[PDB]
């Protein structure tokens, strides 16, 4: 463990993350970011996600949503979150309903604020990246984080916004663009769901799937609509006194590279492929491993066992 292991966009960065952990970076989840190779990041992430998952919390959220009284539901907020549509999605749907050629890309006029952001905050360098597939998978995963946070906070910026997005994104929390130690797209969708069921305040499968459905529509909007989402994500991290390091190591270049080199075909195929993969999933594909020794259960089994206990409790 002597040679430094590079990370972030096109594996060009180092040192920044370890320095940030001394400055309060609680999004990073790697024990040793400067000396952990790509494959070892996947092994560590998978072990830590299984340790992080809390079945009691998961089934409690499920039971509140399905069986909670009015007060339980009011303080929790799940039903309100499930009715929310992010502003970016509303913009697509407003254009789409009136489109005469619906297979085309959504036209976008960047706001003065977005233009100033691109001019003042993004790198100006040109890119020659050959390995683009991990970058498009990073866009898919970060759009999920972004949409989930937009839903969780009903479109308002909070003190938890950047943390939530960082935690739900394996490319940020674990600097893991590899994901695999099913297609990479399917793995990225399952990873988003497992992290959304283990880290945030609201842990609900329907909420996680609602966020993936919204990702599909943002991707369908096309390159410029995806830029609008990436600029929003980038701005949230930019002005955070600690988490800006994720703009330095990943989002600055991801956004500038995507603006100059992003492909409309790749984004459209990604929208259709992710939707196919999402639609092939059910709760039975979402599994967690733990000691009581070892046991692997899918989330539906956990729900049924909790529903059975509750039904037996209400009987007595």
From Swiss-Prot:
Keyword Iron-sulfur: no
Gene Ontology CC, one term: nucleus
GO biological process: box H/ACA snoRNP assembly
Compartments, as annotated in UniProt: Nucleus
Domain of life per record: Eukaryota
GO molecular function, one term: unfolded protein binding
Keywords per UniProt: Nucleus
Annotated family: Belongs to the SHQ1 family.
Additional free-text comment from the UniProt record: Present with 7060 molecules/cell in log phase SD medium.
Biological role: Involved in the early biogenesis steps of box H/ACA snoRNP assembly.
Assembly notes: Interacts with CBF5, NAF1 and NHP2. The interaction with NAF1 and SHQ1 does not occur when NAF1 is associated with the chromatin.
Protein name: Protein SHQ1
Organism: Saccharomyces cerevisiae (strain ATCC 204508 / S288c) (Baker's yeast)
């Amino acid at each position: 463990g002597i040679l430094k292991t590079k990370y972030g966009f096109d594996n060009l960065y180092d040192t920044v993350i370890s320095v940030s952990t001394s400055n309060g970076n609680d999004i990073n989840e790697l024990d040793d970011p400067e000396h952990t190779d790509a494959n070892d990041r996947v092994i560590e992430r998978l072990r830590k996600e299984n340790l992080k998952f809390d079945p009691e919390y998961y089934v409690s959220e499920y039971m509140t949503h399905k069986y909670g009284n009015e007060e339980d539901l009011e303080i929790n907020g799940i039903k309100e979150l499930l009715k929310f549509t992010p502003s970016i999605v509303k913009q697509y749907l407003q254009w789409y309903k009136d489109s005469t050629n619906p297979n085309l890309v959504m036209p976008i006029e960047f706001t003065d604020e977005e233009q100033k952001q691109m001019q003042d905050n993004l790198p100006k360098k040109s890119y020659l990246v050959e390995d683009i597939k991990p970058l498009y998978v990073t866009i898919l995963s970060v759009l999920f984080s972004y949409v989930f946070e937009q839903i969780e906070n009903e479109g308002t910026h909070t003190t938890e916004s950047a943390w939530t997005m960082g935690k739900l994104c394996p490319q940020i929390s674990f600097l893991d663009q590899q994901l695999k130690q099913s297609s990479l797209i399917k793995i990225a969708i399952i990873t988003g769901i497992r992290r959304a069921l283990s880290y945030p305040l609201h842990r609900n499968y329907d909420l996680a799937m609602k966020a993936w459905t919204f990702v599909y529509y943002i991707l369908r909007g096309g390159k410029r609509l995806v830029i609008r989402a990436l600029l929003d994500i980038h701005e949230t991290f930019r002005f955070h006194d600690v988490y800006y390091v994720y703009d330095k190591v990943l989002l600055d270049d991801l956004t500038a590279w995507f603006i100059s080199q992003g492909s409309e075909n790749v984004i459209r195929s990604l929208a259709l492929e992710m939707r196919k993969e999402q639609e092939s999933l059910s709760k039975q594909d979402i599994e967690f491993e733990c000691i009581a020794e070892w046991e692997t259960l899918n989330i539906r089994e956990m729900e049924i066992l909790a529903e059975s206990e509750y039904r037996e409790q209400q009987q007595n």
